[PDB]
Amino acid sequence: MIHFGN
Amino acid sequence: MIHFGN
Amino acid sequence: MIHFGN
Amino acid sequence: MIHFGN
Amino acid sequence: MIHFGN
Amino acid sequence: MIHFGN
Amino acid sequence: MIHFGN
Amino acid sequence: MIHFGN
Amino acid sequence: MIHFGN
Amino acid sequence: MIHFGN
User: Fold this and answer.
1) Per the database entry, which stretches of residues form a coiled coil (chains A, B, C, D, E, F, G, H, I, J)?
2) Is the CB of residue I3 less than 8 Å from the CB of residue J2?
3) Interface contact flag, J6 I6, Cβ < 8 Å
Protein backbone atom coordinates (compact mmCIF):
# COMPACT_ATOMS: atom_id res chain seq x y z
CA MET A 1 0.00 0.00 0.00
CA ILE A 2 1.10 3.50 -0.85
CA HIS A 3 -1.21 5.98 0.82
CA PHE A 4 -1.00 9.76 0.56
CA GLY A 5 -3.73 11.80 2.23
CA ASN A 6 -6.27 10.60 4.79
CA MET B 1 -3.05 -0.22 -3.66
CA ILE B 2 -1.95 3.27 -4.51
CA HIS B 3 -4.26 5.76 -2.85
CA PHE B 4 -4.05 9.54 -3.10
CA GLY B 5 -6.78 11.58 -1.43
CA ASN B 6 -9.32 10.38 1.13
CA MET C 1 -6.10 -0.45 -7.32
CA ILE C 2 -5.00 3.05 -8.17
CA HIS C 3 -7.31 5.53 -6.51
CA PHE C 4 -7.10 9.32 -6.77
CA GLY C 5 -9.83 11.35 -5.09
CA ASN C 6 -12.37 10.16 -2.53
CA MET D 1 3.05 0.22 3.66
CA ILE D 2 4.15 3.72 2.81
CA HIS D 3 1.84 6.21 4.48
CA PHE D 4 2.05 9.99 4.22
CA GLY D 5 -0.68 12.03 5.90
CA ASN D 6 -3.22 10.83 8.45
CA MET E 1 6.10 0.45 7.32
CA ILE E 2 7.20 3.95 6.47
CA HIS E 3 4.89 6.43 8.14
CA PHE E 4 5.10 10.21 7.88
CA GLY E 5 2.38 12.25 9.56
CA ASN E 6 -0.16 11.05 12.11
CA MET F 1 0.81 9.02 -16.78
CA ILE F 2 -0.01 5.54 -15.60
CA HIS F 3 2.19 3.05 -17.39
CA PHE F 4 2.13 -0.72 -16.96
CA GLY F 5 4.39 -2.80 -19.19
CA ASN F 6 7.30 -1.57 -21.31
CA MET G 1 3.87 9.24 -13.12
CA ILE G 2 3.05 5.76 -11.94
CA HIS G 3 5.25 3.27 -13.73
CA PHE G 4 5.18 -0.50 -13.30
CA GLY G 5 7.45 -2.57 -15.53
CA ASN G 6 10.35 -1.35 -17.65
CA MET H 1 6.92 9.47 -9.46
CA ILE H 2 6.10 5.99 -8.27
CA HIS H 3 8.30 3.50 -10.07
CA PHE H 4 8.23 -0.28 -9.64
CA GLY H 5 10.50 -2.35 -11.87
CA ASN H 6 13.40 -1.12 -13.99
CA MET I 1 9.97 9.69 -5.80
CA ILE I 2 9.15 6.21 -4.61
CA HIS I 3 11.35 3.72 -6.41
CA PHE I 4 11.28 -0.05 -5.98
CA GLY I 5 13.55 -2.12 -8.21
CA ASN I 6 16.45 -0.90 -10.33
CA MET J 1 13.02 9.91 -2.13
CA ILE J 2 12.20 6.44 -0.95
CA HIS J 3 14.40 3.94 -2.75
CA PHE J 4 14.34 0.17 -2.31
CA GLY J 5 16.60 -1.90 -4.55
CA ASN J 6 19.50 -0.67 -6.67
Assistant:
1) none
2) yes
3) yes
Cα–Cα distance, E4 to F6 (Å, whole number): 32
Other CB atoms closer than 10 Å to residue C6's CB: what's the count?
7
CA H6, chain centre distance (Å) = 7
Q: How far apart are CA J6 and CA I5, in angstroms?
A: 6
Q: Do G1 and H1 touch (CB under 8 A)?
A: yes
Which of G4, J2, F1 shows the shortest CA–CA distance to A4?
J2
The type of residue at D1 is: M
Expressed in Å, this structure's resolution amounts to 1.5
